[PDB]
Amino acid sequence: MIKQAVILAGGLGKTMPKGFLEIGGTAIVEQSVQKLLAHGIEKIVIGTGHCNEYYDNLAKKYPAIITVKNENYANTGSMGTLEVCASFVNESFLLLESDLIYDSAGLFSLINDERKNLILASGATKSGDEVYLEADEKNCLTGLSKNRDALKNIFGELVGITKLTKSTLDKMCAYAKIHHSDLPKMEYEHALLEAAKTIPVAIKRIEYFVWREIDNEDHLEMAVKNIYPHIVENEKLRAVRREVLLNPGPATTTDSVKYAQVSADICPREKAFGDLMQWLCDELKLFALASETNPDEYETVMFGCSGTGADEVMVSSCVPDTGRLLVIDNGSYGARMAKIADIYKIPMDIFKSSTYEPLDLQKLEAEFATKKYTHLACVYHETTTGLLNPLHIICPMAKKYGMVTIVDAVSAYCGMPMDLKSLGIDFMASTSNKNIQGMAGVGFVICNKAELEKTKDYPMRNYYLNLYDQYAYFAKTHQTRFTPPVQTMYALRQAVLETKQETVQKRYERYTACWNILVAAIKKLGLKMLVKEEHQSHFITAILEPETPKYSFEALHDFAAEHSFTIYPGKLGNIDTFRIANIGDIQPEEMRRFTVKLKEYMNGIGVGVLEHHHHHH
Amino acid sequence: MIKQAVILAGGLGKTMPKGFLEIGGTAIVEQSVQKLLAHGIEKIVIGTGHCNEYYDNLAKKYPAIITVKNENYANTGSMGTLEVCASFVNESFLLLESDLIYDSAGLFSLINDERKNLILASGATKSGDEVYLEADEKNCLTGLSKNRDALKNIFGELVGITKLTKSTLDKMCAYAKIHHSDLPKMEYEHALLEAAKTIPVAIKRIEYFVWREIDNEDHLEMAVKNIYPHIVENEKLRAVRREVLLNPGPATTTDSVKYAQVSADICPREKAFGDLMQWLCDELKLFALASETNPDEYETVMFGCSGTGADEVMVSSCVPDTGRLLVIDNGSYGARMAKIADIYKIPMDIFKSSTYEPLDLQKLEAEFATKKYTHLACVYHETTTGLLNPLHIICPMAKKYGMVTIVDAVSAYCGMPMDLKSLGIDFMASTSNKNIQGMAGVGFVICNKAELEKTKDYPMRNYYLNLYDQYAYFAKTHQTRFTPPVQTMYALRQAVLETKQETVQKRYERYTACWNILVAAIKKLGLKMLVKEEHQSHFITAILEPETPKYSFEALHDFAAEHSFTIYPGKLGNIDTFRIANIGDIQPEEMRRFTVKLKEYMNGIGVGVLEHH
Ligand SMILES: [Mg+2]
Ligand SMILES: [Mg+2]
Ligand code: NI
């Protein structure tokens, strides 16, 4: 696993950086950034020079980009840009030139090779400036030249994508500093060749690797006609069938998240995996904390689990027999929390309320005021109807009466901004397969650390789902208690990375745009929403089923499915409904195509239309 | 998801079918079979003709193969072989010719394309006799010829791998029947073109797809010299770094199981996924039942869970307050079952015994005879030391005294033949990341159905891990209570398929061969095994650490990891040990390489003979 990458973009061409020449509508260096992020890169250091503003503006779209300018770019070569970048590199890394177009498989190849220092090379490209590599019995670099008559053998041609350790970069930089006066325009290939004399730098030769440098006009124009369609074909060969899921459970994911599950087998006890788990714990909690909130006041505890499993974790680990829990039940998640508390014989009372209209906050405060209750359990967003409870009022108020707050945010977390501190939330549960847009398998609880340890002496009500034992064992040892869903957690790492890329606020805006399109269509058709828009989460909408016998949920479902849309049925006993969610990787235009299909069906069964009769004496 | 495939192998070229020409050491049809299985194919129908005995022998190595002979293969074309096969095809399927070598990505492409009828085509191959396809603006098939003069356009060249619906095959066979007399040597390409006039058959053109048919003498060696290395390069571009894990946890898996996680997003409530889960239950229970025992007497209940989760499911769902549970504890799994029973306040007693020596079966029988206990909970294989408890004696004996049997087989199931009926096991737990060689995430309990049903009215001790609620909800509705680990379960399906390919008996023999290599090396090194060989499972071995201060677990571990081997520490406080497992996709040659590395380290610290002056 490579976490960091360096893009060299100091040198000159146009009135443009060559990385910003556009193919298929997007600048080529931006496509390089996208492929790198797709393979799990966390930090991309771009060494800029001529026309730096372009890269500085591109960095505003990708938080992973750090632009570092080589101010002496006109008097130096690529190694100067590299040394300028090198202070920002902490680990093994990928080194790329900005003018490349390449099959992303190369990345996958370089990352999946054991050899720590590894140059990517191709077969005969019969291009213009070829960089030829000379290799030994162990396919390690022995020579490098742009003239074939200078090398004892020719193993391949330099692509411009190389995997290097921080130590190799240190040697390259030391050799560069020693020669700043004699060789001020040294290329990085030279420094790597010299470093290869004391450090084995292997070459991985992909004979038919598809790639091209876009520096000139010849390669620029031959790439659009021959090389780039080849790259697009190769990359789409790995594309997965896109199903647009309109259910609030596992939704549509990006293919990069899908492939994050594909990784080397690892023993979960190893320090690398414990590091992955610590990283996940640290990163997941920040999606539920404002920047102003100290992340150290909170912890994350993960389980191989569904979201309801994390709810059971909270309910069965946070309420001692000494206390009494008040459970708010205005939906199926709250009812499930009540049932869990009941099964465990937890001292509890239930506050039942409507599934599609807001809670009576004054009756809620009246019940808070009795001071009977030590703990409050409630739900932020009930997917049964899409009602959004005002926990920013409910939970601080419960805090005012001395209660500990336990919250289901399984279908709210990462879909909307949250700050547990100002929200007055001590324990918050969520899962990996909802608005974080990962794969199902990991449930987790973000805890106020003080409230979490006050749990330390509670008698255990269970084993696998006990919050404090799970947290403490990984605090003592760098390991989890039992085997975690390793591949699910790799996928979750990439989902977290892409959440940091998209931002929670802009993810909310995307969900809301899809919701707006759907609601506009619902209004245009005369269909009725159960929850008024003021109180709706923009994540799922419950729609009243038409009373006509011509309507069938199965018919609408199969019709939508024939066009790659998966709609969700209703769950209420009181009211016949169907549900449309818009989370996951759904795009607004996909919601409009579905909306066109929905209008087609509803008109076809007589909704929004006059019923014309054609009989006549 | 494509479950079926047809390979046409009727005509001749030598004294063997062309599919059995060998490149890279393996017959090309065997490579095709392996690539198909790797992509999740469950049934391969091979239409045979000349020298069918070769394919009949190949079917002995691959349970997925059904060989059906075109008895009139000398008087028919490829469509006759197809008609012979067509009665054995029930769903959408892949149609492949036997003399093909191809980039396996094509399979992945055809399976992941939404279009139901789909011809795979390549760019200009510049070979002999090429089949050119003429397509409309949709890229749908309108023409087919080996003369470019006859086609209004040239969209690509037919590869010989096609995805088809059962209805399209019905149309081709109907058109074939009426023309058995005039056109007895009809090719399948012709019947497909005829069906394509009334059914849209799309063409997917991978312009640079690497493939060749091995038909003449020219192409065979043009392929060994140029095409086949290209295919190998392309496929290794997708290869995952192979780490050989010697821990009993998640071990080394096949890349096919890894990539089975990559699938179209699906809502778990959809009927296709409920069918996948029903299939998983039905197939998973068979790995713990002999052929003679009725699978209807048993059920499988799955949870998003580790193995300890399944243990907790069993103990917290199978023992009522009215009864009394005896837990055998000769290892960490038994201690964990005891701890769970205690946390849930189960009326329970502990039978403690040595972690590395066999249970005293007579003292145990004496405790059974007390008639104090309604339930017995025990472990088949303790990875703490590799001790294998004689459950074939213990559990039938417990049944003889009227007890309900609860068994941890987390590290035994699918590593050795098991039959719950003759073993007297009522509830058996296991996981997805051990001997089945899948990915972690799914725990499951195989239950005697009658004993499972007497659980129906026990008060629930929990919710997520309650056995009967989980089972009943999926019995009633075709759905699970909560969101299951969908992708882990696709990986588990592929793992089940590969277990059916290998068979549990031969997997046991593979594990035991690795264990034999390791034990021979241990003996040659003078190291001591804590458990006697007759009570060892053969899946993991606990080895006493050398007394020399030159030894460090840290050093041995880093040295092994430096060569892609992951060794496991010991678990006892009483005796300092390290552990070597040999499960997962481990191959004997990899075990032999590890033994050489182990010898190197151990010699470097002095476990060789000492003779000097
Ligand atoms: Mg350049
Ligand atoms: Mg053929
Ligand atoms: Ni009328």
Author numbering:
A (entry chain C): 1 to 13, 21 to 624
B (entry chain A): 1 to 13, 21 to 620
Quote the study's own text.
Herein we reveal widespread occurrence of nucleotidyltransferase-encoding genes in phosphonate biosynthesis and characterize two representative enzymes as phosphonate-specific cytidylyltransferases from the Gram-positive actinobacterium A. rimae and the Gram-negative spirochete T. denticola. These enzymes efficiently activate AEP, presumably for subsequent capture by carbohydrate or lipid nucleophiles. As predicted from gene annotations, the overall structure of the enzyme included an N-terminal PntC connected to a C-terminal AEPT domain. Structure determination of PntC from T. denticola (Tde-PntC) and molecular dynamics analyses indicate that PntC selectivity for the smaller AEP substrate is primarily driven by active site steric constraints.
In contrast to Ari-PntC, the larger two-domain protein Tde1415 was readily crystallized to afford a 2.72 Å structure of the apo enzyme and a 1.95 Å structure of the product complex obtained in the presence of CTP and AEP substrates. Strikingly, the presence of two adjacent magnesium ions in the Tde-PntC active site contrasts with the single ion observed in the Spn-LicC complex, and each apo-enzyme has one less metal ion. For example, a two-magnesium mechanism is favored for CMP-Kdo synthetase (KdsB), FomD employs two metals for cytidylyl (S)-2-hydroxypropoylphosphonate hydrolysis, DNA polymerases commonly employ a two-metal ion mechanism with evidence for an additional third divalent metal ion41, and terpene synthases require three metal ions.
